[PDB]
Design an enzyme around this catalytic site. Structure first.
Site, PDB file in Angstrom:
ATOM      1  N   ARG A 102       0.855  -1.181   0.000  1.00 13.12           N
ATOM      2  CA  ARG A 102       0.000   0.000   0.000  1.00 13.12           C
ATOM      3  C   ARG A 102       0.892   1.231   0.000  1.00 13.12           C
ATOM      4  NH1 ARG A 102      -3.000  -1.411   3.708  1.00 13.12           N
ATOM      5  NH2 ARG A 102      -4.957  -1.895   2.631  1.00 13.12           N
TER       6      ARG A 102
ATOM      7  N   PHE B  24       1.531  10.680   1.215  1.00 15.18           N
ATOM      8  CA  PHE B  24       1.092  10.157   2.494  1.00 15.18           C
ATOM      9  C   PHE B  24       2.102   9.167   3.069  1.00 15.18           C
ATOM     10  CE2 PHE B  24      -2.491   7.507   4.700  1.00 15.18           C
ATOM     11  CZ  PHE B  24      -2.068   7.939   5.940  1.00 15.18           C
TER      12      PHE B  24
ATOM     13  N   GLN C 216       3.469   1.623   2.918  1.00 11.48           N
ATOM     14  CA  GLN C 216       3.217   0.619   3.936  1.00 11.48           C
ATOM     15  C   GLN C 216       3.631  -0.768   3.468  1.00 11.48           C
ATOM     16  OE1 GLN C 216      -0.909   0.537   5.150  1.00 11.48           O
ATOM     17  NE2 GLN C 216      -0.706  -1.355   6.352  1.00 11.48           N
TER      18      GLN C 216
ATOM     19  N   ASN D 110      -1.780  -0.735  12.208  1.00  5.83           N
ATOM     20  CA  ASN D 110      -2.558  -1.516  13.146  1.00  5.83           C
ATOM     21  C   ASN D 110      -4.032  -1.606  12.725  1.00  5.83           C
ATOM     22  OD1 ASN D 110      -4.119   0.704  14.323  1.00  5.83           O
ATOM     23  ND2 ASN D 110      -2.177   1.359  15.267  1.00  5.83           N
TER      24      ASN D 110
ATOM     25  N   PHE E   2       4.629   1.561   8.336  1.00  7.98           N
ATOM     26  CA  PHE E   2       4.648   2.483   7.220  1.00  7.98           C
ATOM     27  C   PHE E   2       5.689   3.571   7.379  1.00  7.98           C
ATOM     28  CE2 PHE E   2       2.224   5.911   9.287  1.00  7.98           C
ATOM     29  CZ  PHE E   2       1.561   5.217  10.308  1.00  7.98           C
TER      30      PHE E   2
ATOM     31  N   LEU F 264      -2.474  10.942  12.723  1.00  7.74           N
ATOM     32  CA  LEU F 264      -2.104   9.610  13.198  1.00  7.74           C
ATOM     33  C   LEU F 264      -1.446   9.644  14.589  1.00  7.74           C
ATOM     34  CD1 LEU F 264      -0.555   8.169   9.900  1.00  7.74           C
ATOM     35  CD2 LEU F 264      -2.992   8.010  10.674  1.00  7.74           C
TER      36      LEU F 264
ATOM     37  N   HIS G  40      -0.958   5.554  16.058  1.00  4.15           N
ATOM     38  CA  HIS G  40       0.087   4.678  15.553  1.00  4.15           C
ATOM     39  C   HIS G  40       1.370   4.975  16.276  1.00  4.15           C
ATOM     40  CE1 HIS G  40      -2.470   3.318  12.270  1.00  4.15           C
ATOM     41  NE2 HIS G  40      -2.975   4.534  12.377  1.00  4.15           N
TER      42      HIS G  40
END
EC number: 5.2.1.8
Lengths: 6, 163
Positions: B54, B59, B62, B101, B112, B121, B125
């Site tokens: 991903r 951004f 991951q 997660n 990531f 986040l 995270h």
């Protein structure tokens, strides 16, 4: 889904 | 001193380059150690051969899925999942290394690398490291991403370990 974009 | 790990990244097997990370063992030892050991493969499983599945431009990138008995989604070195260690560190900009997660206290192997500040986040995270060398390679990876995260070529961890 992975970390949210917002 | 904090450990350093590296990934050698490939694009459909063609070598792209090396990304190295400092792991903040001084602040999140349990989380750092998980990533460190998964990077060396010393427990008999880990990141070698896994993909960044991903990648969302602007951004994050991951990865960290690998196969084990109860899943294809990876696992930690402490059994399947582990608790959020702490939220001391923030997602302050490009190069931050943080845990993926499925809600609170569900850390496994997935992680990531941020390519931007992602403050929404923070507290969700666990940040546990940062890119040291090879941010140019992370930027290169980013170009194989897409808005929904699907990659246009297979971005793999050809090799990884401890520096």
């Amino acid at each position: 889904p992975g970390p949210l974009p917002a | 001193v904090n450990p350093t790990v590296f990934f050698d990244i490939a694009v459909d097997g063609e070598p792209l380059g090396r990304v190295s990370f400092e792991l903040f063992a001084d602040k999140v030892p349990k989380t750092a150690e998980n990533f460190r050991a998964l990077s060396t493969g010393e427990k008999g499983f880990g990141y070698k051969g896994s993909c960044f599945h991903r990648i969302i431009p602007g951004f994050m990138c991951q990865g960290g899925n690998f196969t084990h008995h109860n899943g294809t989604g990876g696992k930690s070195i402490y059994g399947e999942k582990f608790e959020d260690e702490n939220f001391i560190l923030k997602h302050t900009g490009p190069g931050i290394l943080s845990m993926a997660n499925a809600g609170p206290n569900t850390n496994g192997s997935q992680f990531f690398i941020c390519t931007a500040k992602t403050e929404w986040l923070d507290g969700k995270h666990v940040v546990f490291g940062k890119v040291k060398e090879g941010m140019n390679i992370v930027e290169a990876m980013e170009r194989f991403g897409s808005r929904n995260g699907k990659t246009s070529k297979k971005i793999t961890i050809a090799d990884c370990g401890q520096l």
